[PDB]
Amino acid sequence: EMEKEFEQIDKSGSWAAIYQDIRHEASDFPCRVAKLPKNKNRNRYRDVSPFDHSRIKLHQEDNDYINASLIKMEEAQRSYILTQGPLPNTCGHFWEMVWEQKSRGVVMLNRVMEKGSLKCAQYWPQKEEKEMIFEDTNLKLTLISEDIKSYYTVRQLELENLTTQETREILHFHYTTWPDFGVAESPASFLNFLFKVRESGSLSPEHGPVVVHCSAGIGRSGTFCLADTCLLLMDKRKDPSSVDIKKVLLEMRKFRMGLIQTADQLRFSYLAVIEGAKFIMGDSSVQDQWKELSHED
Numbered sequence: 082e083m084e085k086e087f088e089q090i091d092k093s094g095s096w097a098a099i100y101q102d103i104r105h106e107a108s109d110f111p112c113r114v115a116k117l118p119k120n121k122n123r124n125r126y127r128d129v130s131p132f133d134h135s136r137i138k139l140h141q142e143d144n145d146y147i148n149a150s151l152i153k154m155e156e157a158q159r160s161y162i163l164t165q166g167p168l169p170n171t172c173g174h175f176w177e178m179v180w181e182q183k184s185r186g187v188v189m190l191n192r193v194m195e196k197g198s199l200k201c202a203q204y205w206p207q208k209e210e211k212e213m214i215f216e217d218t219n220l221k222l223t224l225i226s227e228d229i230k231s232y233y234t235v236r237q238l239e240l241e242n243l244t245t246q247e248t249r250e251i252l253h254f255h256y257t258t259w260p261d262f263g264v265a266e267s268p269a270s271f272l273n274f275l276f277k278v279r280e281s282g283s284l285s286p287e288h289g290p291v292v293v294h295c296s297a298g299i300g301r302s303g304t305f306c307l308a309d310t311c312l313l314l315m316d317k318r319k320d321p322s323s324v325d326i327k328k329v330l331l332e333m334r335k336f337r338m339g340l341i342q343t344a345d346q347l348r349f350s351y352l353a354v355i356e357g358a359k360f361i362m363g364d365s366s367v368q369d370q371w372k373e374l375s376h377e378d
């Protein structure tokens with residue numbers, strides 16, 4: 082059904098019209114805390130801020146601001162934290178957020194350098210023997226192992242609360258071939274990566290919300306969460322036709338501004354959900370088909 086809607090929009094060539102409608106319908110809530118003068122150096126982009134009602138607050142008395150939003154999909158019963166690529170001065174805040182929110186997975190959809198510019202701090206260690214200590218938030222981070230595939234890398238990290246000496250395993254899922262304001266190479270390649278995140282346990286309700294980011298934490302991050310929630314809703318009722326992608330996106334836009342930054346990303350979201358529906362509706366072999374088509378070795 083979503084498939085036939087997809088074909089209607091393609092034949093009309095009205096992806097831009099549909100996407101601008103979403104933009105005009107999208108919620109508009111205040112971002113007063115993000116705009117305080119004292120927080121200016123905590124925001125990577127002047128025009129990408131968390132709403133006050135849904136922002137993640139750090140558990141510190143000094144300044145609890147971080148550019149991060151809690152997306153709570155009530156009906157699908159999944160939550161995500163969407164955040165910007167950490168800044169040189171906010172890597173401690175980032176890992177403090179991960180600790181306090183009890184997240185098990187971090188999904189990173191960007192490269193540290195994209196289009197010749199630095200999009201994100203190097204906020205996790207690249208070498209086992211060179212751990213990182215974030216002195217402002219009293220956290221230590223150690224690379225434990227790395228599994229490099231052709232277009233994504235999975236890292237096992239150990240996060241230590243230096244104050245309590247509690248340790249935690251964090252899984253890092255790094256998509257390395259998704260261009261800013263672009264789409265993944267194929268649905269199959271995107272779905273293969275999403276299902277790798279799912280199979281790690283990182284999205285399970287026994288854990289805190291997965292942390293999802295790219296550079297701004299809205300475009301690629303929005304595509305990832307939208308596809309996931311749509312597939313989860315379909316799974317819940319085994320009813321692909323009860324899932325209205327545009328309504329799920331607007332619901333997600335109540336928690337964070339600008340989710341999906343281009344009409345082509347919206348169109349890709351449809352493709353990913355339409356294709357992923359094959360798996361959700363009983364055809365477990367398409368998962369293997371996606372892994373082959375993705376060429377991850």
Ligand code: VO4
Pocket residue numbers: 191261262295296297298299300301302342
């Ligand atoms: O770094 V993103 O522009 O896909 O929000």
